[PDB]
Structures are given as C-alpha cells and as structure tokens.
Symmetry: C3
Subunit: 131 residues, 3 copies
C-alpha cells in the first residue's frame, strides 16, 4: 500500500473555503496560496504589510507542518499588475529580510498578474522539506 497525503490547517492562519492550506506527502510540504490576510480575516493595508503578513502565514503553516522557512525549496510570487516600480522594489527588500542568507535563498520566480480584489501580492507553489 502507498502512503496518503495529509491535509492540515494551522489554527493561527486564515483558511479559505476552496483552498487546501497545507498538504504533506512523503516528507514534503505544499502550501495553498498565501496572501496578506491575518487570522481575523482582515486584509492588511499596502504592499509592505500584506507582504509581511503573507510570509508570517507561510512561516506559521510550515512550522505547524514540521518544516520552516529555511526548508523551503521553491516558491512563486504573483505581484499585482497594479503595483508601481517602488512597490515591486519594496517587496524584494522585504523578501530579503525573510530570506536573509543570499547563498541559501529558495528557488523563485516572480511575475505580474491580475489578483483577486484588494490583493497586492500572493505567494504560491511553496514547496518545502520536513525536518
């Protein structure tokens, strides 16, 4: 028999009806899309606060799933098509505060897309190893 994937919900991170928050399979963790919404369901104001909240959500989910930010292998970034050059640059400044070791930064891509209402940034396809 083969092992089942397991689906988890970190109680300190917002959970969306249509979206698996965390999946674990064969020592690997996958996350559903993460956005700058706190546990109370409040979307934070501006690129910076949405970015900080997004990576806080990711950190909490990964640690809940026996992983962590330093175990992320790959992730994708969707920035809103509405963002200015300064907002995109600020995102990357904040990104480097989350992943502070240049040598071990995870695989990344980043493109502009039309996100759901109010969203300035979304981080998707987070793949991480378990501890």
């Amino acid at each position: 028999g083969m092992p089942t994937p397991t689906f988890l919900v970190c109680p300190d991170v917002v959970k969306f009806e249509n979206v698996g928050q965390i999946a674990v399979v064969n020592g690997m963790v996958y996350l559903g899309g993460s956005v700058g919404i706190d546990k109370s369901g409040t979307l934070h104001k501006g690129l910076e606060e949405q970015t900080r909240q997004t990576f806080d959500n990711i950190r909490k989910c990964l640690e809940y799933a026996n992983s962590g930010l330093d175990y992320i292998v790959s992730l994708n970034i969707f920035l809103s098509t509405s963002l200015s050059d300064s907002e995109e640059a600020r995102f990357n400044e904040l990104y480097r505060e989350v992943f502070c070791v240049p040598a071990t930064r995870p695989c990344r891509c980043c493109v502009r897309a039309q996100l759901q209402e109010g969203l300035l940034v979304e981080v998707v396809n987070v793949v991480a190893a378990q501890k």
Copy 2:
C-alpha cells in the same frame, strides 16, 4: 529517466507531456476543456467540467485520483466576470466535495490561448 504516460481517453497536445510518474508521485501537463476528439467545449461551465474530467482520467490511468491531488494551480481568463469566477468555484466544490481534503490551490487571471476560459496546471498527486 522519468516515465511519461498518455491516457487514451484524454486529449494529448503535441508540445505537452500529459502524465509523468516519478517515485510514487504523478505530475500532469496543463489541462483544458477539450474532449478526447479535440473539441473545445463552449463556456466556463462545460470547459470546467471537461478540464477536471481530463485530470480525473489521467490520474486514474496512473493509479492516482482526484482525492490524492496535493496541489494544483488555476488560471482563469481575464475576460471572465465576477459571477463567472463564482460559478467556477461552485463547480470546483462539486469536484472536490470533501472540504477538509481539498488540495492546495491558487487562482489568478491570465491571458489564455484562443478560446480558453480556464486552465488547470501544476497538478501534483500521490499514487494510490
């Protein structure tokens, strides 16, 4: 070297590997609302149902299934209205009807190839 499969009952695109099996995991190429004969169905409803039928058949051909999907990505056409996006999600919940085991997902708008209203990509699933 990775094993590539083609389910005979699902459309196969020239440039696109349909199914890959690697170390008990199944990966799929992009899926759209085109049936076995190569006919693109009209409208979001029919395209959505056909897309997930394609995914289901591909996964079952590799002894996986919808219930063993860990993650997927959705691209909806930029042309879709809010009500169309809402309708997509209603249909999505009819495919994944067990709330607790819904796969990781993300959903954004994109400029898709001609005629396409929805595309589901990066489907990753475990073998049963």
Copy 3:
C-alpha cells in the same frame, strides 16, 4: 536543510535560488535569456535558446539533464504576437526533439520584468 547549488556558468540573481536538490529531485529558480555575464539577449530566439541553455547547464551541474525534466512552466510576454508564440514552440520542439518524453508543460502570457520575452519557471527534474 535542502541543498542549494550555483552552476558558475549560469547567471545567479540576487533574490533567486538557482538550483535546489532534495531527495533525488532538482528544482530550478526562474530562467530567462540572460548569459553568464548578465547580458539580456536581443530577440525571442536568442532569449529562448539562452533560457534553455541555462536550464541545461543547471540540471547537468546538479547530476540531472534536459532528458530528466518532469515538469516546467512557460511564461511568454503579453507583447508577443501569434507568429512569435509559434516560433517559440518551434524552438521548443528543437530542444525537446523526442515527442514521447517531452516534459509536463503549461504556457500562458504574463507581464514579465523589463526586457524579458520569455521565462521558464517551476522546472522539476529527477537526478541520474
């Protein structure tokens, strides 16, 4: 923690892990038509060829190769015409010239960073 590698013959971007190896699988950061010196090539063909050359070099550096790719995603610039997208796919079939082993693929238009006509992301490959 997972092993991150840098192939010294391929450009590395400040914010971007170039190569990650985990449990006999290789993941790549986004690849674009920029050479080792950091020069973005002019035109779709040269950017396309450079992008897949970068991918080839990274995979071979990580005990893998183009023939071990399981899945990848393509983002083409929204500025590209239909004829240019067709040209990209011709070039794609030159690189992946064995039809049966072409990796899982999806391809959509997106607004890429300055100057970029094509970007290949989410490359996942098995190790030898």
